[PDB]
């Protein structure tokens, strides 16, 4: 939130500056909310806006062939572990199956199948 | 002839509501990421 002093010139005694009143309301917390138009001198509510250009859009897009090497680097460690990774996934699905049969759950079983899907199709992409 | 062309416009109205929901269901998943993570 912001608070601005008064240079007047649009106000003098009593006028209505600050065109285009829209978006949110007062909110804030306690003290400065009680008086808005009564005392406008050192406090009153405002809004926050951000203006970005076309070049500033791709500036934050750099988070996602430098990163391509890291894709195959993780596949190298999982290449020798391909037997150990699927060993823990299949044995986990077997234990979760017995819990579903003894219920007479599906939330913990669906979470394991999601990790298996990501470890399969991505592993095929290495070829 | 007048009532025959009325059925052709009803098929487009069903398409307008069908194509929007198919696009909306994929955009609702983006709002869920801004919801459960923010709250």
């Amino acid at each position: 939130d912001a608070f601005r002093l008064i240079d007047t010139g649009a106000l003098i005694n009593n006028l209505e500056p600050r065109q285009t009143t829209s978006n949110t309301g007062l909110l804030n917390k306690a003290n400065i909310q009680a008086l808005i138009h009564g005392l406008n001198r050192h406090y009153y509510s405002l809004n926050i806006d951000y203006h970005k250009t076309a070049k500033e859009t791709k500036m934050l897009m750099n988070l996602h062939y430098e990163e391509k090497e890291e894709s195959n680097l993780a596949a190298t460690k999982s290449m020798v572990k391909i037997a150990e990774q699927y060993s823990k996934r299949i044995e986990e699905e077997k234990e979760l199956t017995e819990e579903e049969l003894k219920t007479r759950p599906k939330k913990h079983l669906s979470e394991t199948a999601d990790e298996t899907l990501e470890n399969n199709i991505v592993s095929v992409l290495t070829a | 002839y007048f009532k025959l062309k009325k059925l052709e416009k009803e098929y487009e109205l069903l398409t307008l509501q069908e194509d929007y929901i198919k696009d909306e269901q994929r955009h609702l998943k983006r709002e869920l990421k801004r919801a459960q993570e923010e709250v």
Partner: protein, 849 residues
């Protein structure tokens, strides 16, 4: 039973054997077509043989190969070589398909080739085998005495030969049925025909059909002229009516073309008809000068509303925390619109003292809506507020110029040279606080006065203002140029306003140029796609915001399936809550063709997220269905009323107010609970500030004009839309950037009543009219079904539902002309044998002069 024995005889050379082998296949078809597919290439090879004369019968069977296979694309191609062997009236399973399939092939080869040439049906561009069969079905429909199937099939085929020949040959004289048939093809051209070029050809041919017959409906004569927007056929109507001039003939079409014709169409009828002679009493009527004076008395003596309604709501909040002072001036103008009642401003003196200079902007401009309709006192009453007199601030002069163009809108050509020359003198010298405010109001004054009229000097005068990089004087300068570009306008301003928008670093100037682009293209439909693509391709939130308004104005009225898909993709793409809100508001203008399917689309977006979008969906029912109303649309706005969000309830009370205009018991039982909620928000002090804006506005919408006027974007006369009404409502639904955009709603006020005018004295007579409008069925509120008749004189309040059954009595020696078309508007009557005046209604014109 196999096809081998009959198809094996074609491998030798004989004249008799080849004939008997082919004729045996025509007898047995449904059994033997299984094995013909293997022999298909051997059968079609005989078509190219010149010594083979059975190709007429061979092509008939060869077409049945794919016809029995299930492929109708190739079945119609090989069936065209049968010539006389192709049956017509047999009405068999093979005839009722290939003929109907050839109709679909006739349409596909028509619209695709219609762009290059419309004469393709005459030339060899189209296969004459399809045209010959197409003409045989035309004569078949003529024997059944059905003009819907005969004339309707030629609309989608793009052929002017059959439409002109068949419709004219069926004209008999009586003529009441022939006009209805012409009215059908004009409405059928809206549904079936998606191209505006083919409509322009139908409007010209349908005009000359009724010009040869002396007795014809004059409402249809103007129906083709307004939609065509051409002065060639407009002046032709007055040529035949010059010697045929009559009380209810030449004066009947004058009042209907006031709001139907554009600004350029009215200037041509006055200038061109002057050289050939014209009625001096009918002069100002074409421009519309006296037209606003007829309802000055109607809204005065018949006004049942109380002035104390606004006094009780205004006295609730005053002084500190000043908000309503901007909204009260808006609600004051609606109820007093047309009545020229200034007593509210002169009632409470402290209200003028507590009103600041920014409050005086909407307070002095409120007189434009109140005094709207009086062009003599416009500058006389506002003279102290108008420039030239010493005031306490520049906002008083700027606020007066904004409301100055409300009364003079479209007639401001006399005041154009005065307003724009001040901007030119203040363009080179600026930077002072008094200079920027003076030009800010002058730009709003020159825009509304010249609104609808194309002027080059006005466009050039506001161009140099944007080059000085001033956001105060540049915001109003952008909207002034857009009001002159309404309708057709100049296409050169499309690329100019789009280029200078990206080169300006000011927010208000860039936003004003983006909104002005939508006002350039009005009714262009697909012709505006060049501007729609360029505005949506930019990353600016202001340019993407105005893109939805371009689709709303261009596709207003008759819409298209492709225009709705563009509005739905913008709402799910851009993250701006205002741009997403402009998409659901634009959905109301494309649905103006049918108000039944409007709530079906809105109900899906009412329960969605993004409350900013839900605020725009409330006006979706306040745009299309606000002119009529529906019980199903009330339930859609129910969750928006109970929504705890502040600005959503603001949009709910506004939409519910326009639907309930002129509603009472035994009609809409829900009007009682909704109307009481308008005064409950004002009474309750626990509500926030943002939720109290819609409370004072809703109470002024229903009572606007003393319930003698309604808010409607259009009416059905010529089948067109109003320029100032549609554009004015686009702003009425937008409170975000500048709140009191409701001042533009005054241009959309349509009085609802039936006022007869006798051409003998050129006045309003007084006589009873038999109608079903008796209060036992339909009535009006005070502060479906029909049984018993009703009789009342003129100059009385008539609801839009009551104007359908209005009928003139012929025993009083008053001959009606227009009778009842199912809506409002002036009906000029005639006189058979004038002897003595019956009755006369005294208006306010006698008290002045």
């Amino acid at each position: 039973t196999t096809a081998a024995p009959l198809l094996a005889l074609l491998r030798e050379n004989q004249d008799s054997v080849k004939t008997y082998a082919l004729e045996s296949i025509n007898n047995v078809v449904d059994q033997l077509w299984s094995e013909i597919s293997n022999e298909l290439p051997d059968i079609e090879a005989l078509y190219d043989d010149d010594t083979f004369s059975d190709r007429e019968m061979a092509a008939l069977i060869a077409s049945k190969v794919y016809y029995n296979l299930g492929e109708y694309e190739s079945a119609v191609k090989y069936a065209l070589a049968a010539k006389d062997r192709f049956d017509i009236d047999e009405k068999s399973q093979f005839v009722e398909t290939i003929v109907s399939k050839s109709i679909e092939m006739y349409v596909q080869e028509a619209s695709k080739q219609y762009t290059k040439d419309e004469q393709f049906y005459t030339k060899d561009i189209i296969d004459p085998k399809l045209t010959s069969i197409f003409e045989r079905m035309i004569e078949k429909c003529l024997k059944a005495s059905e003009l819907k199937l005969a004339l309707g099939i030629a609309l989608e085929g793009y052929r002017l030969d059959i439409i002109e020949s068949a419709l004219k040959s069926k004209l008999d004289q009586s003529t009441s049925e022939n006009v209805k048939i012409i009215n059908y093809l004009l409405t059928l051209a809206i549904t079936t025909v998606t191209n505006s070029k083919f409509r322009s050809s139908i409007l010209r041919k349908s005009f000359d059909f009724l010009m040869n017959m002396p007795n014809c409906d004059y409402l249809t004569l103007n129906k083709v002229v307004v939609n065509l927007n051409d002065a060639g056929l407009a002046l032709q109507l007055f040529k035949k009516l010059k010697e045929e001039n009559d009380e209810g003939l030449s004066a009947q079409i004058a009042f209907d073309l006031v709001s139907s014709a554009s600004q350029q169409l009215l200037e041509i009828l006055v200038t061109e008809l002057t050289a050939q002679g014209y009625d001096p009493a009918l002069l100002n009527i074409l421009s519309g000068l006296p037209t606003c004076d007829y309802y000055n008395t109607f809204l005065l003596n018949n006004k049942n509303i109380d002035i104390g309604l606004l006094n009780k709501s205004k006295s609730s909040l005053d002084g500190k925390f000043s908000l309503f002072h901007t909204a009260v001036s808006v609600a004051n103008g609606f109820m007093h619109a047309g009545t020229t009642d200034n007593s509210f401003i002169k009632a409470n003196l402290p209200w003028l003292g507590k009103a600041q200079n920014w409050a005086k902007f909407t307070a002095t401009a409120s007189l434009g809506v109140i005094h709207k309709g009086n062009l003599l006192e416009g500058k006389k009453v506002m003279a102290p507020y108008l420039p030239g007199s010493r005031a306490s601030s520049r906002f008083i002069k700027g606020g007066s110029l904004y409301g100055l163009g409300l009364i003079y809108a479209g007639f401001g050509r006399d005041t154009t040279d005065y307003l724009k020359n001040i901007i030119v003198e203040n363009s080179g010298t600026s930077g002072d606080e008094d200079v920027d405010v003076l030009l800010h109001g002058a730009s709003l004054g020159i825009g509304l006065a010249a609104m609808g009229s194309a002027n080059i000097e006005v466009y050039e005068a506001l161009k140099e203002v944007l080059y000085n990089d001033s956001a105060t004087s540049g915001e109003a300068a952008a909207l002034g140029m857009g009001l002159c570009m309404l309708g057709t306008g100049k296409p050169e301003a499309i690329h100019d306003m789009f280029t200078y928008s990206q080169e300006t670093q000011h927010g208000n100037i860039t936003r004003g140029l983006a909104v002005g682009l939508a006002l350039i293209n009005y009714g262009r439909q697909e012709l505006a796609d060049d501007l729609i693509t360029k505005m949506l391709a930019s990353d600016e939130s202001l340019l993407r915001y105005g893109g939805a308004f371009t689709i709303a104005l261009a596709y207003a009225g008759t819409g298209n399936n492709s225009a709705v898909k563009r509005l739905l993709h913008v709402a799910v793409s851009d993250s701006n809550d205002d741009v997403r809100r402009a998409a659901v508001i634009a959905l109301g203008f494309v649905l103006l063709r049918d108000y039944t399917t409007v709530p079906r689309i809105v109900q899906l977006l009412s329960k969605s997220h993004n409350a900013h979008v839900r605020c725009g969906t409330a006006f979706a029912l306040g745009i299309a269905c606000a002119g009529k109303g529906l019980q199903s649309a009330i339930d859609v706005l129910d969750p928006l009323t109970k929504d705890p969000v502040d600005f959503v309830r603001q949009a709910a009370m506004i939409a519910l107010s326009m639907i309930l205009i002129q509603q009472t018991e035994k009609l809409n039982p829900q009007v009682a609970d909704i109307n009481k909620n308008f005064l409950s928000v004002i009474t309750n002090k626990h509500q926030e500030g943002l939720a109290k804006f819609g409370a004072c506005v809703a109470q002024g919408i229903m009572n606007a004009g003393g319930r003698n006027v309604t808010i409607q974007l259009e009416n059905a006369d010529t089948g067109t839309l109003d320029t100032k009404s549609v554009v004015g409502l686009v702003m009425f639904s937008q409170f975000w950037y500048w709140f009191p955009l409701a001042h533009f709603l005054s241009l959309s006020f349509t009085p609802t009543t039936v006022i007869g005018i006798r051409g003998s004295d050129q006045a309003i007579p007084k006589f009873q009219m038999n109608c079903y409008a008796k209060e036992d069925a339909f009535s009006y509120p005070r502060m479906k079904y029909s049984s018993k008749p009703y009789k009342v004189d003129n100059m009385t309040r008539i609801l839009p539902q009551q104007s359908r059954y209005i009928s003139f009595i012929k025993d009083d020696r008053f001959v009606p002309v227009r009778k009842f078309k199912g809506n409002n508007g002036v009906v000029v009557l005639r006189d058979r044998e004038p002897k003595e005046p019956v009755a006369l209604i005294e208006t306010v014109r006698q008290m002045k002069d």
